Design a protein around this ligand. Structure first.
Ligand SMILES: *CC(=O)N1CC2(C1)CN(S(=O)(=O)c1ccc(Br)c(F)c1)CCO2
Ligand SMILES: *CC(=O)N1CC2(C1)CN(S(=O)(=O)c1ccc(Br)c(F)c1)CCO2
Ligand SMILES: [Cl-]
Ligand SMILES: [Cl-]
Ligand SMILES: [Mg+2]
Ligand SMILES: [Mg+2]
Ligand SMILES: [Mg+2]
Ligand SMILES: [Mg+2]
Lengths: 10, 230, 230, 10
C-alpha cells in the first residue's frame, strides 16, 4: 500500500 | 498570458465556478492568471490554487502509475513506453508551471507564517512529484530541492505556528512521505510522523475553532502512515 | 492530423492504454487518429471510440449543467454566463468533431447492421447533446437532425436485428430519452420505451451469449425510465 | 430526476 499524503479539502 | 485581460476578482470568481463544475484544468488556469496579477493570495485563494493544481497533477500521477506498472510488467512494441513518456512529459510540465509560479510570484520573505510555510510546502510537494518520475542527474538535483524546501518550511513552522496548525501538520505529513517514499529513509519518516502526532496531541488545546477538523484529519493520517509503516 | 504519423495498430493499442489510465481525452485523440486511417472499425474499436468521446462530452455536459443551474438561479456580474459559454463552446466543438468523423469516415451504405445502426445512433446522440445547449435557428436544425438520424437507425435495427440486440436496445433507450427530454413528447417516449421492453421480453430467447449482460442492463434502464415517467 | 440514457461499458 502507498503512503498517504495531505488530501484535497474545501 | 491568456488570462491577462481578465480582472483579478473575475478570475477568482471563475476559479470557484470551475471548482463547482469539477473543471480543474480551467480552475488551475484561472488561479494562475490570478497569481500573475502580482498581488498576494489570501488563505482562501491559496486553497483554490492548491485544489486546482493538485487535482490536475493527481490525475496525471495516477495515469503515470498505471502506465508505469503496465510497462514494468511487460519488462518481464514501444507503445507503452511512448505513452508513459507522453504522460510523464505533461506531468513534468505542470510541476514546472507550479514551481515557476512559486518562484516568480508567491515565495518571498514577507507575509505571514501561514503563507510562507504553505508555499514552501508546495515547492517541496511539486519537487517530490518530479522526483517520483525522475531518473538521472536530474533526479539528484530534484530530490535535494524537495528536501531543502521542506526543511525551510519545517524550520519556520516550528518557530511560528502551534503544533496543531493544519499547514504545519500537512507539511510534516508530506515531508514524512518524502522520507519514506522518495528518500528511502523509513526511520526519518516514522520519527517525523511520530514526533508530529505526539506534539500535536501534547498541545491539543491549541486547535483553532476555524480549522480543527483539518488538524484532526491530518493527525489521523499521520497515525495511518505510522500503522502502515510499523 | 497529430496522429497521422502513427500506425493504426499503435493508435488502437494506445487508446486501450489511455482507457486503462482514465485518460479519455487522449483516448479520444488516439481513436480519431485511428478512424482517420480510413479503414472500418470493428465492434471492439467502435466501443473504444464510443467510450472515449462519451467520457469527454459527459464531463462537459455535467459541467455545463452545473454552470447553467448557477446561472439560472442568479437570474432570480457577467462571469457565470461567460464561463458557461466557454464550456458550451468546448462541448459544441467536441460534438462537431464526432459528427464530422461520422460523416467523413464512418457512416456509409455498406457494412453490417451493427455498424450502420451504431453510427447512426451515435449521430443522433451527438445532435441530441448539441440540442441540450442550443437556442435559435440553430436549435430547430439540430433537433430534426437528431430525430432523423435516430429514425434511420430504428428502421434498420427493426429490420435487421433481433429485439434483444444491445445496439438496438441502446438506440431505442436513447431515442426515447430524446422524445422525453428534447422533443417534449412524453407519450412518444413512454410508447417507444414500452414497446422496446415488451418486444425484447417477448423474444427473450434471442439474447446472445456474448452480449446478454448488456441487453439485460438496457432493458432494466428502459424499465427505470418507464417507472420515472409514470 | 433526469432520464437515463445508455451508459458507458467495457
Ligand atoms: C490558510 C492557508 O494558507 N491555506 C492553504 C490551505 C489553507 C492549506 N493547505 S495544506 O496546508 O496543504 C492542507 C491541505 C489539507 C488539509 Br486537511 C490540511 F490540514 C492542510 C492546502 C490549501 O489550503
Ligand atoms: C459491436 C458494436 O458495434 N458495438 C458498439 C458498442 C459495441 C455498443 N454501444 S451502444 O450500442 O451504444 C451500447 C452501449 C452500452 C450498452 Br450496456 C449497450 F447495450 C449498448 C457503444 C459502443 O460499444
Ligand atoms: Cl504516445
Ligand atoms: Cl470564461
Ligand atoms: Mg479594471
Ligand atoms: Mg521523460
Ligand atoms: Mg507502416
Ligand atoms: Mg454558445
Amino acid at each position: 500500500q502507498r503512503s498517504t499524503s495531505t488530501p484535497n479539502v474545501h | 498570458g491568456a488570462m491577462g485581460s481578465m480582472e483579478r476578482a473575475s478570475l477568482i470568481q471563475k476559479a470557484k465556478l470551475a471548482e463547482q463544475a469539477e473543471r480543474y484544468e480551467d480552475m488551475a488556469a484561472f488561479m494562475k492568471g490570478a497569481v500573475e496579477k502580482g498581488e498576494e493570495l489570501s488563505c482562501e485563494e491559496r486553497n483554490l490554487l492548491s485544489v486546482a493544481y493538485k487535482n490536475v497533477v493527481g490525475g496525471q500521477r495516477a495515469a503515470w502509475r498505471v502506465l508505469s506498472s503496465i510497462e514494468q510488467k511487460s519488462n518481464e512494441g514501444p507503445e507503452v513506453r511512448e505513452y508513459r513518456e507522453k504522460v510523464e512529459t505533461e506531468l513534468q510540465g505542470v510541476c514546472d508551471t507550479v514551481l515557476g509560479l512559486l518562484d516568480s510570484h508567491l515565495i518571498k520573505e514577507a507575509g505571514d507564517a501561514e503563507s510562507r510555510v504553505f508555499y514552501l510546502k508546495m515547492k517541496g510537494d511539486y519537487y517530490r512529484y518530479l522526483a517520483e518520475v525522475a531518473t538521472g542527474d536530474d533526479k539528484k538535483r530534484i530530490i535535494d530541492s524537495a528536501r531543502s524546501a521542506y526543511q525551510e518550511a519545517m524550520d519556520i513552522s516550528k518557530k511560528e505556528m502551534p503544533p496543531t496548525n493544519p499547514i504545519r501538520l500537512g507539511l510534516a505529513l508530506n515531508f514524512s512521505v518524502f522520507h519514506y517514499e522518495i528518500a528511502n529513509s523509513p526511520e526519518e519518516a516514522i520519527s517525523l510522523a511520530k514526533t508530529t502526532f505526539d506534539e500535536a496531541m501534547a498541545d491539543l488545546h491549541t486547535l483553532s475553532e476555524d480549522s480543527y477538523k483539518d488538524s484532526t484529519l491530518i493527525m489521523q493520517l499521520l497515525r495511518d502512515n505510522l500503522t502502515l509503516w510499523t
